[PDB]
């Protein structure tokens, strides 16, 4: 999308996997505010927004908290309490038409600066000293939007870059989206430390002979001793018995 009419999207209720981003591109800009990129794949958030648009080369520096510029002033502003990451990569391969791509436009004139995460689409004619002309030239009476003019020969300072901004949320989260929790192959008949979906204990695992009802996941004998557990992957029932011990 063009920057003055950027496109928000929500991502929730998934197992987010951030190991796909690195394989995309050399990532001319990849910086994160409030989080580290390597420790990103293990925390859970409520709702994750993704804001994607296209800007010029020497303006990628404006997508940052508290920076006053021209696109961070009139058509995309993000808070000073930001928490998330930004990712921008050069895409002169796909957006630059010969002769000029007058399809990516940006707001050049506005009455007042805009609030964080605010979008405006109206293309009303801008105000002048006196009552504007009418979507036409005059003393001022200018028109707000302006094109870009991408061409394949421009420097890497006026070449088009695609940029996507991820915004997270963390407070009082009945968490909806975290990372993948990798598993390991099962071992049977050996004293082993196990972690079945959160239930931690030790013992030797043996094939069970008791009929768990389909909505049950744990088994207990008298006095709360976890006696059995069903595998969360293949659903076979497994018996737990503590490995041998005694006095000498």
């Amino acid at each position, epitope marked *: 999308a063009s920057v003055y009419a950027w496109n928000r999207k929500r991502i929730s209720n998934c197992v987010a996997d951030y190991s796909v981003l690195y394989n995309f591109a050399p990532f001319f800009a990849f910086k994160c505010y409030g989080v580290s990129p390597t420790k990103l794949n293990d925390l859970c958030f409520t709702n994750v927004y993704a804001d994607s648009f296209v800007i010029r080369g020497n303006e990628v520096s404006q997508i940052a908290p508290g920076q006053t510029g021209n696109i961070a002033d009139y058509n995309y502003k993000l808070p000073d309490d930001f928490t998330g990451c930004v990712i921008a990569w050069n895409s002169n391969k796909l957006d*630059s*038409k*010969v002769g000029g791509n007058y399809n990516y436009r940006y707001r050049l004139f506005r009455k007042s600066n805009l609030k964080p995460f605010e979008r405006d689409i109206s293309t009303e004619i801008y105000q002048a000293g006196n009552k504007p002309c009418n979507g036409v030239a005059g003393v001022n009476c200018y028109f707000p939007l302006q094109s870009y003019g991408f061409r394949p*020969t421009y420097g890497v300072g006026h070449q088009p870059y695609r940029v996507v901004v991820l915004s997270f949320e963390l407070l009082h989260a009945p968490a909806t989206v975290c990372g993948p929790k990798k598993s390991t192959n099962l071992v049977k008949n050996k004293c082993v430390n196990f972690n079945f979906n959160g239930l931690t204990g030790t013992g030797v695992l043996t094939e069970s002979n008791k009929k768990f009802l389909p909505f049950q996941q744990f088994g207990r004998d008298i006095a709360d001793t976890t006696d059995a557990v069903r595998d969360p992957q293949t659903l076979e029932i497994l018996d737990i018995t503590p490995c041998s011990f005694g006095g000498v």
Partner: antibody
Amino acid sequence: ITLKESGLTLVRPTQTLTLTCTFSGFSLINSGVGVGWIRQPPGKALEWLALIYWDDDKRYNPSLRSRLTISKATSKNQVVLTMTNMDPVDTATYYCTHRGPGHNTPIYFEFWGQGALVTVSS
Amino acid sequence: QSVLTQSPSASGTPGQRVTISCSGSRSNIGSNFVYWFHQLPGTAPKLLIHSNDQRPSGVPDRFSGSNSGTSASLAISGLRSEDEADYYCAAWDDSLSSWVFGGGTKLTVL
């Protein structure tokens, strides 16, 4: 990636030319992708007619503007070109060509059709 | 100003290096990319070099391009007998707002 032209190859003067490039291996919905037309008289140099990007930017040859209309039919994965008021000087071969992305700059005319010899006579 | 000019003949000899010139103007060749095509008798052309210095995958190394001001050159090394065909320039002229082409060069090996 393949392209193929089709239409009527022979028409009298003061008539209209229609041509249809049906392609395979790319879609005019991705970014980058575009399709164009280029004519060449017999034994002369090439000439650019029109171009249509993926976002529907119908560029035309100015000197041949006011005569050309290019349109796409993406549902059938085909493009239609139309040029009115044919003349015997418009006898040429018409290729439909493809412009996709490269590695640091867009590629243009990397793949060509096979031409469609068009004769304007009686 | 609005037309690129090429010499009609190159006339090298096997295993030699030859050059093909392309003269443009301030408005098209000096401010845009220069392509170089190669059309053999009875067949659609085939790209050789885009962006003045890059070769599409599948063209031998012996083809080289050069842009200098408002002029253009293609350098063919190791001249062989399978290269006698038409070579065309192409560049976008902002003043004309259209693609423009050259005359063409013969390049017949002996």
